[PDB]
């Protein structure tokens, strides 16, 4: 199934404070009103990755708990495994081996450790760095990806050098989730008095946005 992305999938572009200003930047973004793919775990196939991925999932009951990323997933090369399950974050980057159907049962160069609601995440792999941004909010709409804006904040940057073309999400076994590819796009971003990114324009969306 599919849904319209609306104004979703925007993040803080660099670790610099700016305020009371409009700022123009070019990066991998989810284009406004782009064609998002939609799933119901309540349904976790392997999917392509391309240049980068926006991922989001709904929440009330903690069904979707992590992700796997790589190319072949057969220990012949490195892969990324992320757990994020509200009680724990655990991340490792080994030459992993897996089955075709991984779940949480009811050479590792690096490690990191730490509906009612909506969870948003962005994953991109640039110049040998794999980078993570996220945002979390209450919602009313059970049906679909809700129309609105809020910028994703950087969590983690990994200098890990892994080549990636595919990914998958992880379930607890013996929620709804959304996927959309980023594209190289120019955005105009609004920084308020506190340096919150409060609004954005996709400069390639239509002639008025270009204006």
């Amino acid at each position: 199934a599919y849904t319209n992305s609306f104004t979703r999938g925007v993040y803080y572009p660099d670790k610099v404070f700016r305020s009371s200003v409009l700022h123009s930047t070019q990066d991998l973004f989810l284009p406004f009103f782009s064609n998002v793919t939609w799933f119901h775990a309540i349904d976790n196939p392997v999917l392509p990755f391309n240049d980068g991925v926006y991922f989001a999932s709904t929440e009330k009951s903690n069904i979707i708990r992590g992700w796997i990323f790589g190319t072949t997933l057969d220990s012949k090369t490195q892969s990324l495994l992320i757990v994020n399950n509200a009680t724990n974050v655990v991340i490792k980057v080994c030459e992993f081996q897996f089955c075709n159907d991984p779940f949480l049962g009811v050479n590792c160069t690096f490690e990191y450790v730490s509906f009612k609601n909506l969870r948003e995440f962005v994953f991109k792999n640039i110049d040998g760095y794999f980078k993570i941004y996220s945002k979390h909010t209450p919602i009313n709409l059970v049906r679909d990806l809700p129309q609105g804006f809020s910028a994703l904040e950087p969590l983690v940057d990994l200098p890990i050098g892994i080549n990636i073309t595919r990914f998958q999400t992880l379930l607890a076994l013996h929620a709804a989730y959304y996927v959309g590819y980023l594209q190289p796009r120019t955005f105009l971003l609004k920084y308020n008095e506190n340096g919150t990114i409060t609004d954005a324009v996709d400069c390639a969306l239509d002639p008025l946005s270009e204006t």
Binding site: K15, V16, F17, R18, S19, P159, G161, G195
Partner: protein, 413 residues
């Protein structure tokens, strides 16, 4: 007098140099990390990579000394890009990476930005805007052997050239023509690697050299590598020169209300110039205004009448510099007066200044003219009983000097 390049100054108000005060101290700030960086594990390792399979070491959580590196007797070549080697001990980096391999002494020329040839194109490619240092040394005593050391290899063939920092260790037989190679050499089927086979009898260009490429992550993200230099105490509300994490400048450091998000490390102006910092040793958001400043204007009657002068600090409040707060800025050396006159020297916002008595520079609000009430009523008229013939002079510019220039004689003489 110097700003006008003249020993005589006519009556008026003149803008001179902007108001600044010399830096009180050269402040230094760095994260107080204690570990010496593991560069001995980079440069003095017994094993070393074949250049087709170059080995990267991440360097982080530590203090370096690049002067100890670039002054070391160990190195036969040392070059840097985007930074100069003399300056490295004053900097910090989000990360450093050391990429390491063996090649013959002639081929070291291929380890530079934008290079071409077997090593640059099939083994290890730098980007055009590489920031870092390339370091190399003759390793004949370690890496040559009698009858040849064949353990060191380079990629002889590839279907396409490498992208910057691309890595490729495959040994599949290279198909140089129509022949399907299927895991064996033959007519236009060749093994994709070759060896220098290093021997101690070789001329220096055919002797082994070890290479290290230090790549510097000189980003705005918080530093994990820094040079050996030590932090000073901090200063506030006084003009100072500074270094934070390698960022130099001069200004009045202050506290600030700028509510940085947890990941933000620097703040920038509309000009992209740094206007604020988070201190690396504690989470303090300073503002980096320059020295407390404005333009300085000097009010003078002509030097043909007095050497007395008044000074206007444009937009500066008198607490930040007789003394008088005009809306144009703080005015100093002018006697403020409650009379009003025609404007003599204009200051701005209704204020003017003149030289008056015992003589002094005075400052006053300008008079618009004499006040009058016309004696109006709905049945009174005034009619003139006499007249005066007036002759008055109007002067108009009509032309200017007709200049001509031989631009070839002006430029090239």
């Amino acid at each position: 007098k110097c700003t006008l390049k003249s020993f005589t100054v006519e009556k008026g108000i003149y803008q001179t140099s902007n108001f600044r005060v010399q830096p009180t101290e050269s402040i230094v700030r760095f994260p107080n990390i204690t570990n010496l960086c593991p560069f001995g594990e980079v440069f003095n390792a017994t094993r070393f990579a074949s250049v087709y399979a170059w080995n990267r070491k991440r360097i982080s959580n530590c203090v370096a000394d690049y002067s100890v590196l670039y002054n070391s007797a160990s190195f036969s070549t040392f070059k840097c890009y985007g930074v100069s080697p003399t300056k490295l001990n004053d900097l910090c980096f989000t990360n450093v990476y050391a990429d390491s391999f063996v090649i013959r002494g002639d081929e070291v020329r291929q380890i530079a930005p934008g290079q071409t040839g077997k090593i640059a194109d099939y083994n290890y490619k730098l980007p055009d805007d590489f920031t870092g240092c390339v370091i190399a040394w003759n390793s004949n005593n370690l890496d040559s052997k009698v009858g040849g050391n064949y353990n060191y290899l380079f990629r002889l063939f590839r279907k396409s050239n490498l992208k910057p920092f691309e890595r490729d260790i495959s040994t599949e037989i290279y198909q140089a023509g129509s022949t399907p190679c299927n895991g064996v050499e033959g007519f236009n089927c060749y093994f994709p690697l070759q060896s220098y086979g290093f021997q101690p009898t070789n001329g220096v260009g055919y002797q082994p050299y070890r290479v290290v490429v230090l790549s510097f992550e000189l980003l705005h993200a918080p530093a994990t590598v820094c040079g050996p230099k030590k932090s000073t105490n901090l200063v506030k509300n006084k003009c100072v020169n500074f270094n934070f994490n390698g960022l130099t400048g001069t200004g009045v450091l202050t506290e600030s209300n700028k509510k940085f998000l947890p990941f933000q490390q620097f703040g920038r102006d509309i000009a992209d110039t740094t206007d604020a910092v988070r201190d690396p040793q504690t989470l303090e958001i300073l503002d980096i205004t320059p020295c407390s400043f404005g333009g300085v204007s000097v009010i003078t009657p002509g030097t043909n009448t007095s050497n007395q002068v008044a000074v206007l600090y444009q937009g500066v409040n008198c607490t930040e510099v007789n003394v008088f707060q005009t809306r144009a800025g703080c005015l100093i050396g002018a006697e403020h007066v409650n009379n009003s006159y025609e404007c003599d020297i204009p200051i701005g916002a209704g204020i003017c200044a003149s030289y008056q008595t015992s003589q002094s520079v005075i400052a006053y609000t300008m008079s618009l003219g004499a006040e009058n009430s016309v004696a109006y009523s709905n049945n009174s008229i005034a009619i003139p009983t006499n007249f005066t013939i007036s002759v008055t002079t109007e002067i108009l510019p009509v032309s200017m000097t007709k200049t001509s220039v031989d631009c070839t004689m002006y430029i090239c003489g």
